[PDB]
Design a binder for this molecule. Structure first.
Ligand SMILES: *[C@@H]1O[C@H](CO)[C@@H](O[C@@H]2O[C@H](CO)[C@@H](O[C@@H]3O[C@H](CO[C@H]4O[C@H](CO[C@H]5O[C@H](CO)[C@@H](O)[C@H](O)[C@@H]5O)[C@@H](O)[C@H](O[C@H]5O[C@H](CO)[C@@H](O)[C@H](O)[C@@H]5O)[C@@H]4O)[C@@H](O)[C@H](O[C@H]4O[C@H](CO)[C@@H](O)[C@H](O)[C@@H]4O[C@H]4O[C@H](CO)[C@@H](O)[C@H](O)[C@@H]4O)[C@@H]3O)[C@H](O)[C@H]2NC(C)=O)[C@H](O)[C@H]1NC(C)=O
Ligand SMILES: *[C@@H]1O[C@H](CO)[C@@H](O[C@@H]2O[C@H](CO)[C@@H](O)[C@H](O)[C@H]2NC(C)=O)[C@H](O)[C@H]1NC(C)=O
Lengths: 429, 51, 79, 50, 49
């Protein structure tokens, strides 16, 4: 295999919120001579500690054409070496002595742990982050630097390897030189973080498309606050009187709904909720949702939101063939974390040749049959599951099926018969 | 019965709207009972008052 | 066979139409239904004809049954 | 009234016992889903008096 | 009206400052309509509470 090296690495680590975003700009170079074959692909490696927590990985070449510079990445296992690896296909083969610059972005979940575990209403929130000083790669790195951005400038402690400079809420490390491949050094920082620690433990998204010009979507959301656990009594009087009280606590969040959303309703298991404020922007329907009570560490809540959309915005037809495009998941909030998402699509009864063009990998369960108003044959249902979804996964999906006009006319006939028979019964009696 | 015919309604709705429906049934019973005592004309008056 | 290449679909009946159709269809169904009951109660063993009863009942059922569907859509309980 | 019941529903141990006047026994059980000591039916006078 | 006034009884409370030895404030509603208190456990050291 051709010998490749990491000529330069620049790492930016963002710890402002409950998610750790990592971006590395690497100038990959080919060290092999003419005898070696041109390298069409290169390998990426995950550290064992963080591999489980990797929500998403994206690679794009450094160029103006960012939309087209995204590279196809496939999970691969390299023999004899532990840890997850990815194979990246270059746009053009890299010949001997050439170099290219690529940008790698990874997002990790749950990597910030509250320390201390428990705080009172007055006390602030502190978190611990553990990363790596060096870029963990199969290839040696000639030189590298790191820039770390903290949520707040009040950094309690950090590792001082390499005499890192500290200015304001930013840390600078390196430049390290001649780093061997696979090198690891545990970087530890403890600092104040007050960002909203919200986790969606589970969400169920139900999409129903009806041939009468309407599609209705309902999302069931379970929300838990994963910040430092509250200790001691909760003072309503203090909370109202003082702004500082419960600073970590989350009061409200805003969801960006589809522009065409209509008849938006916000409710709970025990009835309606009147606290949500709705604003209609030209591009999107902004919805402000306030939970019934403010969420402190360890508290949880449940709510259900639903809306209707016009058919012509998203539905497409070519004679008997019908194809619908839908966004996979709603933008519930910025930096949203979803442990488990289940998506169900209910097509009209009599649909045939159902096919789904998934944007990315998703487990698909056997299709169910559903009965609702006017259903005798039953409506076909598509079922899918996924875990550890993040904001980057708000892609588009398309479903294709065949339907016939006569089936719509069937619906009136069933209704008419029931009334007519009642008249007949009177005549017989 | 409603579910049997594939009309899926929440149990909560059934309880909430159970009471108004019976009021209409009560109206019919009132007219017949009044009619027995005196006449149809009284029964129509009773149904209006009870409603 | 992609969305851009292909066409788009909407219900043939436009939303604005629904209020008018529901009112008209139900009214026609109601008139025949009242006629059927009054005829049956007034009629006697020698005054009733099966043919007349069937025609009125069938017409009443057809008009009202379609009207009900428009009512459900107008309310928003899409089938 | 509902807001308090919802708070109890998710933020307390399932086995917790809640004490209140008998007027609210039915409402708490239906929505809070938590055990109560007294109820509207008031089948036991001595229990209420205690 | 002066602080600590009770609107429904139209009177001001006589006893304004006191502490709960055996009860702690768990949750209070926004308008204070419903107040929830948690029962304190026994004393770890066995002191009389
Ligand atoms: C079942 O539950 C559901 C769901 O809860 C219930 O329906 C919901 O009912 C609530 C009731 O309040 C409705 O709330 C409405 O929300 C919108 C959106 O509010 C946000 O945007 C506003 C837009 O402001 C823009 O412009 C200003 C500058 O002008 C900027 O500052 C803003 O940034 C925006 O650019 C904004 O004003 C709002 O801010 C307010 O709230 C925030 C906190 O949320 C505060 O910080 C702000 O200071 C401020 O208080 C907010 O960001 C509002 O626009 C609606 O306000 C109208 O209606 C109010 C009454 O509901 C009324 O008090 C307002 O004055 C205003 O009045 C409107 O109508 C009047 C005529 O009646 C007009 O005179 C007036 O001009 C205006 O048109 C409102 O608060 C939810 O929309 C609604 N949700 C859904 C999905 O329908 C349902 O009722 C429940 N059923 C029951 C109980 O039976
Ligand atoms: C109300 O509380 C009861 C009491 O626990 C809940 O019953 C539990 O239900 C879960 C889910 O089915 C079971 O795993 C538990 O074993 C049940 N516990 C007992 C003691 O029966 C019930 O789910 C709650 N009601 C809800 C959530 O609507």
């Amino acid at each position: 295999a051709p010998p490749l090296i990491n000529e330069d690495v620049k790492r930016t680590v963002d710890l402002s919120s409950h998610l750790a975003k990592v971006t590395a700009e690497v100038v990959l170079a080919h060290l092999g001579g003419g005898s070696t074959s041109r390298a069409t692909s290169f390998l990426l490696a995950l550290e064992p500690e963080l591999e489980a927590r990797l929500a998403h990985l994206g690679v794009q070449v450094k160029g103006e054409d960012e939309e087209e510079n995204n590279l196809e990445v496939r999970e691969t296992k390299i023999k004899g070496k532990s840890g997850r690896f990815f194979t990246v296909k270059l746009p053009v083969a890299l010949d001997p002595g050439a170099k290219i610059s690529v940008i790698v972005e990874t997002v990790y979940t749950h990597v910030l742990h509250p320390y201390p575990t428990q705080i009172t209403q007055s006390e602030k929130q502190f978190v611990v982050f553990e990363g790596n000083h060096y870029f963990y790669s199969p290839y040696p790195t000639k030189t590298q630097t790191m820039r770390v951005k903290l949520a707040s400038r009040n950094v309690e402690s950090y590792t001082k390897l390499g005499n890192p400079t500290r200015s304001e809420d930013l840390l600078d490390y390196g430049p390290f030189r001649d780093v061997p491949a696979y090198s690891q050094d545990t970087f530890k920082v403890h600092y104040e973080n007050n960002s909203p620690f919200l986790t969606i433990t589970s969400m169920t998204r139900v999409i129903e498309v009806s041939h009468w010009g309407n599609i209705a979507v309902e999302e069931n959301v379970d929300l838990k606050h994963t910040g430092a656990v509250l200790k001691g009594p909760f003072s309503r009087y203090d909370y109202q009187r003082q702004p500082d009280s419960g600073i970590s606590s989350i009061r409200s969040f805003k969801t960006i709904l589809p522009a065409a959303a209509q008849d938006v309703y916000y409710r709970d298991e025990i009835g309606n909720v009147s606290t949500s404020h709705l604003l209609i922007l030209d591009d999107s329907v902004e919805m402000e949702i306030r939970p019934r009570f403010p969420l402190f560490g360890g508290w949880k809540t449940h709510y259900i939101v639903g809306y209707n959309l016009p058919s012509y915005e998203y539905l497409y037809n070519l004679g008997d063939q019908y194809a619908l495009k839908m966004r996979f998941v709603d933008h519930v909030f910025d930096e949203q974390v979803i442990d488990s998402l289940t998506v169900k699509i209910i097509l009209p009864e009599g649909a045939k040749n159902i096919e789904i063009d998934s944007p990315y990998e998703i487990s698909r369960a056997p299709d169910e049959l559903h009965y609702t108003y006017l259903d005798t044959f039953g409506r076909p249902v598509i079922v899918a599951y996924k875990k550890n979804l993040v904001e980057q996964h708000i892609q588009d999906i398309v479903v294709h099926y065949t339907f016939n006009k006569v089936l719509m006319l069937q619906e009136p006939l069933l209704v008419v018969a029931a009334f007519y028979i009642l008249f007949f019964t009177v005549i017989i009696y | 019965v409603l579910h049997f015919f594939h009309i899926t309604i929440d149990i909560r709705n059934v309880c909430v709207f159970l009471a108004p429906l019976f009021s209409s049934f009560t109206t019919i019973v009132t007219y017949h009972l009044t009619k027995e005592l005196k006449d149809a004309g009284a029964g129509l008056l009773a149904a209006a008052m009870i409603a | 066979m992609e969305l851009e290449a292909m066409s788009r679909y909407t219900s043939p009946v436009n939303p604005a139409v629904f209020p008018h159709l529901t009112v008209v269809l139900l009214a026609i169904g109601m008139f025949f239904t009242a006629w059927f009951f009054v005829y049956e109660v007034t009629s006697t063993k020698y005054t009733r004809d099966i043919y007349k009863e069937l025609l009125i009942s069938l017409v009443a059922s057809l008009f009202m049954g379609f009207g009900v569907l428009f009512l459900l859509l107008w309310v928003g309980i899409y089938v | 009234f509902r807001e308090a019941y919802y708070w109890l529903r998710h933020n307390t141990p399932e086995d917790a016992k809640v004490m209140s006047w008998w007027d609210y026994g039915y409402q708490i059980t239906a929505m809070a889903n938590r055990t109560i000591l007294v109820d509207n039916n008031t089948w036991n006078n001595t229990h209420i008096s205690r | 009206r002066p602080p600590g006034f009770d609107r429904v009884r139209n009177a001001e409370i006589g006893n304004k400052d006191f502490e709960l030895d055996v009860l702690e404030e768990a949750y209070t509603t926004e308008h204070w309509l419903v107040r929830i208190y948690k029962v304190k456990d026994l004393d770890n050291r066995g002191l009389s509470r």
